[PDB]
Design an enzyme around this catalytic site. Structure first.
Site, short mmCIF file in Angstrom:
data_model
loop_
_atom_site.label_atom_id
_atom_site.label_comp_id
_atom_site.label_asym_id
_atom_site.label_seq_id
_atom_site.Cartn_x
_atom_site.Cartn_y
_atom_site.Cartn_z
N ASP A 57 -9.75 48.15 61.04
CA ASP A 57 -10.03 49.58 61.12
C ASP A 57 -9.23 50.40 60.12
O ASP A 57 -9.56 51.58 59.92
CB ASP A 57 -9.78 50.09 62.54
CG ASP A 57 -10.86 49.67 63.51
OD1 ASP A 57 -11.92 49.18 63.05
OD2 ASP A 57 -10.66 49.83 64.73
N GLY B 4 -7.14 18.26 65.16
CA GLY B 4 -6.32 17.53 64.22
C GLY B 4 -4.95 18.11 63.97
O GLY B 4 -4.22 17.58 63.12
N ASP C 61 19.48 42.39 45.39
CA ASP C 61 20.31 42.79 44.27
C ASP C 61 20.14 44.25 43.88
O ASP C 61 20.88 44.74 43.02
CB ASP C 61 20.02 41.90 43.06
CG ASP C 61 20.74 40.57 43.12
OD1 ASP C 61 20.76 39.96 44.21
OD2 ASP C 61 21.28 40.13 42.08
N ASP D 298 1.36 18.81 58.93
CA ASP D 298 2.10 17.57 59.15
C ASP D 298 3.37 17.48 58.32
O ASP D 298 4.17 16.57 58.54
CB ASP D 298 1.20 16.36 58.84
CG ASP D 298 0.34 15.97 60.02
OD1 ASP D 298 0.78 16.16 61.17
OD2 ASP D 298 -0.79 15.47 59.79
N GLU E 81 -6.05 36.65 43.99
CA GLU E 81 -7.36 37.01 44.52
C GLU E 81 -7.20 37.61 45.91
O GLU E 81 -6.30 37.25 46.66
CB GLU E 81 -8.30 35.80 44.58
CG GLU E 81 -8.57 35.15 43.23
CD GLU E 81 -9.89 35.58 42.64
OE1 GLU E 81 -10.84 35.84 43.41
OE2 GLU E 81 -9.99 35.66 41.40
N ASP F 201 -4.58 32.44 39.87
CA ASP F 201 -4.69 33.88 39.73
C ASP F 201 -4.63 34.52 41.11
O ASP F 201 -4.84 33.87 42.13
CB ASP F 201 -5.98 34.28 39.01
CG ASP F 201 -7.22 33.78 39.72
OD1 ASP F 201 -7.10 32.86 40.55
OD2 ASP F 201 -8.32 34.31 39.45
#
EC number: 3.4.23.44
Lengths: 309, 18, 315, 305, 318, 306, 309, 17, 13, 14, 13, 14
Positions: G107, G219, G21, G167, G197, G195
């Protein structure tokens, strides 16, 4: 805002915190509940001390009446051990107040209590030869007793005087001041009790540990000695903290300074002594002065450079 | 400045805070 | 007439925490005490000692427990036959708090290598029986005595002769009889008692060195005038370090023949120390809280207004 | 602004003989524990020996009224002088009959006041002499000295510090003729009222097998047999020294009185416990008034006031 | 006289969800139905809240010290072990789990199928209580309870393979607090019971992922001395139980001691108020809702009430 | 407007050596549990080698004052440079004497402040050199690589991430003559204070039997014998890098000082539990002031103003 | 009413919820407690994609820095199986920031955190040849670890990285957007944590599951493959939700479109990097904007047609 | 468009506080 | 007697 | 109830 | 001074 | 009398 404090309170604060900012020492006495007859003694020392090169110099400002400080030297990078002995330096007029024998210390006064204990060091060498640093921290040493049996015929048990808390001189405390030697130092001490109490004059004490008592049995780390009985001695121990100063000088250094000490003390005179002519009543109570004493003592740093003394 | 100025400032601040 | 001359012409948080440590220890998730809000504002280190010990009381015997203001030691215990009080042939043995040797060393002359002075803030004790409702029988009595440490002087016939001066305890005679002010109840109800300062101020006390027994060796019990003996065992396990300005709590448990009494003992202590700079305890130190007069007045009033002891259900 | 305990404290402190009974009931300080209050009064008539000087000491020793000694006229006590005590009534009923039994009833004490007065009983045809009073700050301390035993050791005994004030008359003193009498009082010399312990085994100062030279005291204090008197502590008060002189050929007679407001810490097994009570609460105004009145008084006045 | 070097770049009332949260946190058994619906923090995503309750009957052996652990492991109620009387667990002690109902329907039947239904979780409450059953003629002993700050971390150690390599496995730190009685504890007779709760040990609530493949601590082919743990935790076969994760809650330690000849019986109950994160392909997605919005007063009251409460109370005040 | 704990926190964060005694009480945040607060101070006299460069890292590793390494003048650390630690007093009292016994007393920690200072002691006839300071955001992460064993498998180990900031002095820095000294601080690099777990078994980075090339680190960190020092964690603080240069023929001496306001989570069975207390309650104004002051401070100042 | 917010809050909302927009300059940073030095990186994509007839094409918008989307093709009417492999599409300038080696990712930067993630599809076929629909839903995928034993000499234990929550791609979610192909789609994601982080940078990750680790032991339902290490890789996983898009084309259909993307990322730079010059201080706290973020994220639909982008 | 929708949502939310 | 114990703390504060 | 009794004494005195 | 700097910043806040 | 002296001292100090 300063009119809320009476003149005795302001003078007490001045002697407590800033002696060297005035021409004549301001002070009349401690503004506490006690209002008896006392004698205010102002002790000032002007000693020139030169530190040897390659050793560590330890100076203890102890609350011992009539004695300025105790000092000893150890090799650089080390700390005092069981083979170290501290010798005193007297205030001007020790014999005129405490006699010339180890059993006549109480012929003039009978009790005392400390009001201030301040020290300062001012370097006097040039800027092209000095070296080292200055470290200052405080230790809470007290005077106590020890008990140990003796195998006599018949056997018995003894009781002698010992100093507890001397172990704080063997290591630098976390709360300390350290800077270059050429800057100087100026530190003050405060009372370590909730109230100002009187202490009794002791008799017969010349060495700690005393004669015929070996080190180790007393538990002390080192020895405090005062020499002959006609020149110096220890007559008491007040309720003040001990200032510890270490001066380090590498090899080839040329260090020298002028040491100054101040003290506000109160004494209890005897009727038969000449000191009774100058006695006076202690100042009355002043609560705000004591509160300001505690607050200012809490808010000040450990030490400052000599330029801001 | 000098030490007496520091003490005066501390005392005045403490009195003002009360 | 001859001439005459020279004629004279709300509570702060530290206060609430202090009250909490002083009066109601076991009713909080954490111990809240921080320090004594008196004039002194130096550098102090606070420790809170708690002991959990399970004991069984012998049948047909009387057991005396003393809670004395000796740092690092929980209580002293001694057993006497039923209906009898301690005699000159009775010695009390101590039971230590956890970590005694980490604070007071392992030598009788090494009691001041970490701290140099102390002053008490609180003292507490409680008993919780752990026996069923058939096998118990007896009662519990508590009272307080003002014991203090003093000196005694007596001559000794040496060659040449001289005079002696040794430590002694004055006020121990209160253990020999039940005081008029006491709390007595059945055994199964438990007990919970506290102590308070016996001086008009809080004064730091020094650390005593070399004390292991009272009276010490080579000194007879008759010379000192003490009623009984206070032994502390081996040098490397326990010892006497000082005597604070607090009252001693005496607890007597009586169990007749055929009784099976078992309980759990707990003891709390809000304490304050003065650490050496070279010690490892200096990093945990802080500054004592400032003055708070209202807290002190409340402390005095609550100490005056409380009963001697209460049952364990209201601990 | 004064509560009743403060007024009673001041009354016991300053004006004993002006009321029907002793009104004091305790010291209104912060401490509010269990204490026992006792008021001691001694009433004795004494006749002074003519041609000699008599010295009377009023020391803060519980259970003892005063110590007295006599010297040749115009002199002062010396190394050959000894002071003997005069007890309050009922010393043995409170401190036992043995040197090792002084703490069998109480454990601690503290002083509140100690007064004295002399009322002459001679006519206007015999009396001759004068009365002088002054105060000395005598306290108790310790001394240390080695002993040449096998093996050698060091000792520690009790000594009295401040006794040199007796050997001279200070600038602050009261002196008048004998027939006018005297009246004086002492006051606390500490910023607060604290408790002192009960000493044991002390009968003489210096003790046995200890010479007077090694302690530094000017003279000796003796109490006699352990079944009659002894020393059980030294409080935080001031000592009053009174000297009475009489020319040869004169007759002087008077009456000696002494008061004391004191406190104790009773034992649970003692028979004095049932008379105990709680200490009164704090009163700042009473303490300030006590300090001011104590500071604003002369050394002594005549018996008429 | 040297020129200075220049410097640069120098520079209200509560809400209904809050009350429900407090009720699920502090007072479980005082209401007909569990009131808790969600944590009124900033997060307002899609969650599925599940409440687990267990009713177990347990008999305590005479002459043994029985230790019970209430750890923040989803799907497991408590761990149990027994040692000779008067002692503490040693290196030979092994703990075993007691599952909540419906473990298989939520965490599968294989060690690598733990995340088939959910993806993450976070705790809100944790409670326990003991209600004695024996009469007043045969019981003997006491009950002691204290908390420990047990957390999960990693340990590294070398392995002498060809060529040699380094290993990184899971380990638990803080388990040494079980070996002694804490200074802050509740001790009383056995017949009076106990009731205690835990609280969050973090400044805020955070989501923890689902761990896979863990069935023992220390794991297989790893010695106990290499990790440094005091004892061993076991979970049995993968078809019945397993370790899924570790939350940000304090561990409750309960010791029951009984002398010889005693007969102690009681009922042990547990409560849990836990949020999840469902997978759209699972059947649990249909019951989900949105987390309640922020509530500052509720959080402040939570912290204050958590501080104010004692360690434990007797069963009469459950 | 600030409570006493807020002022104490600000003082332990921003003005250590300006007071008689440490006033710190804790971090005034949401957490209100049981903690043990410990303040560490080191006072060491250090003389720098002439004709070489000395690098000092003030890293957020509990129990270690700093790490140091020496390199030829005008050269940054290379792949053959190893940093050695200097312990705080009483390290073995808190963290034992073995690699697998680091969590016997405590289990978690969170930093509150840490700062350094240098006070020269040489006279006005033998000094020569300069000091430069700048900060690097170093963190601890992992790395995964295959192993050609029988059968083949994959391995995962720890690895420091962000160590490449020590090889070049950033635009934001402080640099002056040696004789003037330096005094710099540090601040949290996270939106909130969070406890970190205690790691076990870490003596060197990279660990044994692992080449330096596999991890990708620029150089190596070593702690020596397990009975003297070790690595127990990594806090959420920025790392301060200090470079001291000394021309050949000069003599440089100074005094090094460090401080750390640290909070711990003690074990119930430890002897440290009796010294603990409760964390102070929430104080938003103190947190805002802390953020603003930490943002508005310069990198470093001369030793005269400290 | 918009004057109650600061400029950074409005800019943050604009970068978060509506990139297309505005012409340029969406936002500056996240107005939270952190006030350190960060670099704001904005990524845009413009790719033309064609969907084969008779196959189902899946597109995943994952919070993987430096990569736009992952795609795979399945026969129509089916879902990805254990034989499916996904391949990435990079943003412009991956190697300029993350190097050309598997151990060179950190780096230049050290940490990252997301602030926005958007996508849009714009059909470009004619009105008489298209056929099919478009389905959109979100899945909460997180990165975790797995532990399993390996039988070597001596036997040891392993610990590798795995993805949990994958899944959710095997079935259509209850909250989904479905419409005709020619109308387009536009969706967005939001933070899934209380929050913001920072996350660390991972190294050595090329495939999930990694090399020498077979499927079934991890799994995961399917495999993610990043190909050669010199062009693309996986360097982290942020705290955001994954957007799943499925496009189905029946037989004989002719479908094509244009795919776009946006990102609002914050980095922590290193002093030795070139991008350190463009860093600045993060904006200070703004509570109202932080509340409005959650409110708007709660009050918005799953997706809208392309005309309302 | 959509920014209009977001602005309307924000205005409606702010109108009830 | 637990819900009203929690109520007391909130009312007191 | 030990703390409850203590609070009663304080409030009554004030 | 450092404390003076912090105080000045606080006042300027 | 002495009591009059004390009362006068107090009144002057009142």
């Amino acid at each position: 805002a300063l009119t809320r404090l009476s003149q005795p309170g302001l003078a007490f604060l001045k002697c407590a915190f800033a002696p060297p900012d005035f021409n004549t020492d301001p002070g009349k006495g401690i503004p506490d509940r006690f209002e008896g007859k006392v004698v205010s003694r102002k002790d000032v020392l002007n000693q020139s001390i030169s530190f040897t090169a390659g050793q560590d110099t330890f100076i203890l400002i102890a609350p011992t009446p009539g004695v300025a400080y105790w000092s000893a030297s150890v090799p650089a990078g080390t700390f005092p051990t069981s083979a170290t002995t501290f010798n005193p330096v007297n205030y001007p007029g020790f014999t005129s107040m405490f006699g010339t024998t180890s059993t006549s210390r109480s012929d003039q006064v009978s009790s005392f209590r400390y009001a201030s204990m301040n020290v300062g060091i001012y370097p006097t060498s040039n800027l092209m030869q000095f070296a080292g640093s200055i470290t200052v921290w405080k230790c809470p040493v007290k005077l106590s007793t020890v008990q140990f049996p003796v195998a006599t015929d018949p056997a018995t048990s003894s009781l002698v005087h010992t100093l507890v808390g001397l172990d704080g001189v063997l290591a630098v405390g976390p709360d300390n001041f350290s800077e270059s030697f050429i800057k100087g130092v100026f530190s003050q001490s405060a009372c370590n009790e909730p109230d100002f109490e009187f202490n009794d004059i002791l008799e017969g004490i010349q060495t700690l540990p005393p004669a015929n008592v070996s080190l180790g049995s007393t538990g002390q780390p080192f020895t405090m000695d005062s020499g002959a009985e006609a020149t110096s001695g220890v007559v008491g121990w007040g309720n003040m903290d001990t200032i510890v100063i270490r001066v380090s000088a590498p090899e080839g250094a040329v260090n020298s300074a002028i040491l100054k000490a101040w003290s506000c003390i109160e004494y209890r005179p005897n009727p038969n002594a000449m000191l009774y002519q100058f006695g006076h009543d202690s100042p009355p109570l002043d609560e705000v002065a004591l509160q300001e004493y505690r607050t200012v003592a809490r808010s000040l740093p450990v030490a400052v450079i000599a330029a801001q003394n | 400045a000098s030490m007496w100025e520091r003490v005066k400032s501390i005392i005045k601040s403490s009195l003002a805070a009360a």
